[model samples]
Target: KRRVVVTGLGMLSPVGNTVESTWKALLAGQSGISLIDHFDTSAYATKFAGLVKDFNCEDIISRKEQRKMDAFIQYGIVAGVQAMQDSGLEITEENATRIGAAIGSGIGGLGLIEENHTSLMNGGPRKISPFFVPSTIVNMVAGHLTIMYGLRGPSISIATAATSGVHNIGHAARIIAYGDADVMVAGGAEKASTPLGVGGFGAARALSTRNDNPQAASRPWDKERDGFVLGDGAGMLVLEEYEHAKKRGAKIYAELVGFGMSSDAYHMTSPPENGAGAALAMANALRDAGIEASQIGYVNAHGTSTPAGDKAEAQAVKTIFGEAASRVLVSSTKSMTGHLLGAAGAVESIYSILALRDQAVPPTINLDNPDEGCDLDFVPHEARQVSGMEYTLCNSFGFGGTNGSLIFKKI
Candidate 1:
């Protein structure tokens, strides 16, 4: 089988707009959670989210063209453009058919759906725009990206809730490894800070209600954490065949050695209490990578700051890593950027790659007191440098009991 490697990365998060800026903020231990200024929160229990600010897609996407796409698609396109530009791999007519795209949105265009529904109720179906269906669909981002860059191979979008982003990258790797494509632009984007986005989670009691202290709300593994803070943004990566990348003089970020996927078969919105499904995914990833648990030096956990999720993931890690659990460094960037839903996996994957690059692990902020079953070196509050960090594991578990894990090794 052929090898796959990451050539470029792009991100727009609550913390920062670009990959460099976001990484810097994470290293500085800055929190991006804030009050929901986009709408009135007087009627809601959770009033804040990790919202993207000061973003206008006029430069990368035109004003007229932007109207035909939803916020999630817009964010995805911008990040994809940045990643393609960073890779410096020109798509000539000879190679256009060899490149593809796999981008996804967990809850695509919910805000637009809400808006169009309200319009229908107020002014009837005639008020709906012709672009409504196209703009408010999940797979449209992948279609738009394929058209935007003239990519003609294996375009797809995986919508596995929170696992959407990581699954996309992992599936794209399989496509390239099997010779279906030479390069794939893959990742996830989300803009779910709208009314239904906030209200739906709030009604389900899945969001933190720390309105008085927004930044301190998403306390993953901390005793004070009520729930996860909903966040919005997008993250994308350029995955290319290893030989093709090297021949084109593309800078390799890390080798995607292993990718694993599984289902809980237990719950729709919550994980199994014992975390057996999650452990299987991690074990499978390690087996796929041809590495042992001892080989992984760092883990970017899917710690969503929920009462059940944070502890379940920790228990899963303990079960899989065994004695190495104590030695492996674990952290949750969600403590800083809140939870980006579908975009979480790709953004956290970028953080994992950067950790391998800098030999530094980003901290799990707001972890004042670790809960039971959460006994591990979380690299709390500050970044730490490691001398010889080789491999890192990025985990993402989503609703519907879906689970995905990727093992990235230093090249």
Candidate 2:
């Protein structure tokens, strides 16, 4: 099998509009969660969210075409182009067909879908935007990107809830290893902070109701934790065949050693108390990476601040690490960026690679007190030094029993 490595990275997150800005803010322990000022959330349970900073995209997408696409698509396109440029891989006729793309969204274009439905109910089909169908689909991110760059290789989208981003990156690596492509641009995006989005989650009791102190609402492992605060963003990475990357003199981020996925079949939305499902994914990643559990120095946990999820993830990490757990440093950037849904894992992947390079782990902000069974030495309050760390793992667990893990090795 061919080796796959990360060459470039890009992102648009709640805390920052670019990768460096985001990483800086995360390490500085800045909270991106804020009141929902764009909307009136007086009636919703969760009144705040980690909304992406509004930025001008006129440089990336045409003004006319921007309206034809949803926020998620625009975000994905921006991140994708940034990554493509960062990789410095020239795509002439010789290499065009060897480049592919895989991007997705867990909850694809929910805001646009809700808007279209409202238009339909009020003014009939004619009121719906002509681009509604194309704008609201999950695959359009990859579709539009491939068209933009003349990438004639495989173009696919994964829509597996929160696992979408990780699955896309993992599968993209697999495609390269299987000789399907020389390069793949992969990741995910989401924008679910509309009225219907907030209403739906609020109704399901899956959102934090802390309207007073928005920044502290997403307190994972804390006794006062209620629920996760939704976030909006996109993350993308350029994955290249290792030798190809070296031949082209491209800057490499890290080697994607392994990717693992599993389903918490025991429950529809809840993980087992013992965290068996999550551990299976981690164990599989360890197996795929061919490295002992102790080799992993940092873990970007899938800590969503929910009571059950936090506890289960802690147990899962402990089970997966065992005695090696002594050297483990676990933190949830979600405690700062909130949960980005489909975009979560890719951003964590970026964070993990950056962690390897910087030898540091961002703080799990708002972890005031560890709840029962949450016994890991979570790097709390401030970023922690992780000198001599060689490998890092990122975890993402989603609704409907989905779980994904990505392991990266410093090259």
Candidate 3:
């Protein structure tokens, strides 16, 4: 397979609007969780969440287009614009056909689904807007990205739950590696932190009940963690063949050395108690990278502040790394951004690449007390700087037992 590298990244997480703000907040050990303000959640079980505050879609995009897109799609467009600028990609006619899009949204059109359904029942079907069909589709994210960037090759999406982001990136890499395209824009976006969003997760008992301790509620791998919290945002990367990037003098972030995926098929909402599939995904990434488990110096874990999920990932890391797990630094940006569903992997990947670039580990804040099984160096409550980090892995295990892992090598 042809080698691939990440040349640019953009993120709109709860930690902040831009990658720099988010990265600075992460290194400062800050939390973005607070009571829900996007809408009134007085009747909801989990009233608090990691809401993206003060973000006006019209400010980033024109009102005519912004009003037509769902909130999630708006977020993707914002991140995509920044990613293209960051990569210095020029979508000229010469290279337009060689560029592709692989952006995905896990629960696309949720907000639109609810709103349109309500309008139909109360005001009849004729009241629905014509843009509803084109706007509320899952694949529309990739479509929108391709249209916005003038990309004319292999536009696709991966709707694989939380694994969606990493899988999108991985699939894009494969498309480029197989001689289909030279550049692929890949990432994930989701804004499932709305009223219907919280209600569904709350009904399933998948959210923390700490309305009083909103900031500390998303405590992954901690004894007091109840459940994952809802989050909204988008993440994106510009990927290209190594020689193509070098020939263009593009600034490379890091080389994507490994990508692995698997399905547990054991349960719908729970990881297998033994976490066999999760372990395999991590091991497979190492094998794909042609590197040892010990070579990974840090990991951006998918610690979603859920009880069963956290334990499963903790065991899997130890099983794969053994004694080396003791030395490896691990943390979850979800503690700050909440669970971004499909977009989790993309945003977390940005965090990992920045970690590699700066040689600094982002902290998993609010871990006042660690759990027994989660005994690895979580870099709790604060950031740390460590050297000799040639390879790093970012892991995301989604609901329905879907797993995705990727390894990057410093060049």
| Residue 355 local lDDT, model 2 | 98
Candidate 2, overall lDDT?
Answer: 0.91
lDDT of 1 by residue, 91-158 (tens): 98999999998889899998779888988999999988788999989888888888888888899999
Stretches of candidate 1 off by over 4 Å are none
Best of the candidates, lDDT: 1
Compared with the true structure, what per-residue lDDT tens digits does model 2 show for residues 139-213? 999988998899999888998887888899999999999999999999999988888778988898988999999
TM for every model, in the order presented, reads: 0.99, 0.99, 0.98
**Candidate 2 pairs with clashing backbones:** none
Off by over 4 Å in 2: none
Quickly count the clashes in candidate 3: 0
Give the C-alpha miss distance for residue 186 in model 3, angstroms.
0.6
For model 1, the run of ten residues with the poorest summed lDDT:
370-379
Worst 10 residues of 3 by lDDT: 51-60
Question: For residues 80-150, could you state the per-residue lDDT of candidate 3 as single tens digits?
Answer: 87888899978899999999989998888778877888889999999787778777777777887788778
Q: In model 3, which runs have C-alpha deviations exceeding 4 angstroms?
A: 57-60
